[model samples]
Target: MSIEIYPDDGNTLPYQVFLNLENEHYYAQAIQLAQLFAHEVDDNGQLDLAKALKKAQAQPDLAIIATNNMTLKKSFSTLSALTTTLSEQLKIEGVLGISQDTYIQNILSHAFCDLETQKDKPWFHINAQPDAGHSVTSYSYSLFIVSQGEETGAMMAAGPLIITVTPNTAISDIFNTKDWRLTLQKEEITIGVKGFQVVTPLG
Candidate 1:
């Protein structure tokens, strides 16, 4: 999948990189990394419980994670490098995630808002476009969340691994339907993309 950034005002924001990753695992990992950056960890190498207990907390502008697996680790490291380099150049804080839960919702909650504020966050303020195809069993749900601070929060979760069984839809049709497509849009300071490459800077 390719990533592109289109600014509404015709001006590129410093330290911002929009990604459009179609790969399910890749997008999930990226979201996980962002969460790790937002919270401080404890000596046990986990998210600090005390910190988690707090209502709302300050979050980093960016975050990342590194893995031992060659492909995943390299990708995470490269992305982290890109985030750090850009943040440094722009003079903003960027962090790397330690070992922890990589669920899209959990990560997004921490990244987008403090616990207290997250509960009260609002849904997307957009018009609902209905499914046009009559034969195709078009069911829809949200993969992303919205917060008062960040208009949109991208997410990928494990539950989708086993899509809920319904009486009408067959398993194959539910999983392999061609009607499914990942959509993205941007509003205000928030950025959206399917996937992107993290480019190295030159001197």
Candidate 2:
């Protein structure tokens, strides 16, 4: 299964990480994204929600039923702002309309499983390709998965995750099938590979 990103809307991070997840419909609305990032009680006796968030991120687990459930008090340290910041930077007008929702629902929303809950979380990096001269943009959804205690530890798979209509290679090819292959000329895209690593310092 894929490492699903819940409340996929409003979450436009060029790069994201998720784990210990439930089915995409387990929770409702964008606000529920914070729940998927919840963690177990910290043994160090640290109530610092900030630190706990790091714990949640570093170690993602399925919703656990324990003597203590270290969760957030609603939208408190959420993964909201960064997504928008990245979205604006990588936003491409041609593909901004109805097409955007298509990619979010198909690719990033169906990846995590419970057994892996005991292991490490996976990383999702969104790569946008915008070259106006060619009039074609591409987006790559690269994933780097880590298998913590297994013999075949830390496996990585990339490429084929592209949407090429506009800012990404059209949010179609990214799926297992190549439904659309062009834009402005024809139509096509990945939730499979390509990512943003960072180039210039933020201005």
Candidate 3:
């Protein structure tokens, strides 16, 4: 997998990058570490995720950085820059970390739908399968990079193809609650879907 950066002023600045997370453990770790760096600002008035990761290895207290609304926004900005930098340095398409706000907003915007239905090569697919555990079925959304592209540009160049799926009752319940807030690390990051069985939910 490869990563590229587009700094769009009108959109999500530093825009987006490909998230090629395969391992569940590594995925969560990346999210956690991104949050930590997003909160830790320097006297020089900036934060660096790579530097924070290195420092945390030596200073355990440096690991759990907390963020308020303003810092949280700043963190996402750094996360974008950090993601691209690391991708180039590590030579892999890795996680594109975001702030808590961005994550929730993207979920509400149905952003993954753009990648799931690509028309050309290296098409991506994301789907949810119902869980059998409780009255509220948990659906896990997983992304599969069905193909690869050599050109470095917009990850969603397929014109956001439209596909159909089962109605998400669980997601409806979430919206019905009248509380639009989300808590990360406490709640599993999931989306509702149909037409599959026993698929593990991925963050």
- What are the lDDT figures for the candidates, one per model? 0.25, 0.24, 0.25
Q: Find the 10 residues in a row with the least total lDDT in model 3.
A: 153-162
Write one digit per residue (lDDT tens) for candidate 1, span 1-203. Answer: 11233765553434232331122334333444334423333332222334522211322222121111111111112444433332232211111111243333543353233212232223223322343321232132222211111123322211101011111212235453323321211111111121212211100
What are the per-residue Cα lDDT tens digits for candidate 3 across 58-123? 321223122211111112134454333323422112122222343223332332223122221232
Task: Compute each candidate's TM-score over C-alphas.
Answer: 0.17, 0.16, 0.16
1 or 3, which is superior by TM-score?
1
Query: Which candidate tops lDDT?
Result: 3
Q: Order the candidates by lDDT, highest first — what do you get?
A: 3, 1, 2
Residue ranges of candidate 1 with Cα displaced over 4 Å: 1-105, 108-120, 133-177, 190-203
Model 2 ranges off by over 4 Å = 1-133, 148-203
> Candidate 2, which ten residues in sequence have the lowest lDDT sum?
185-194
Sorting all predicted structures by TM-score, with the top scorer first, yields 1, 3, 2
List candidate 3 stretches off by more than 4 Å: 1-21, 37-50, 54-203
- Model 3: what TM-score? 0.16
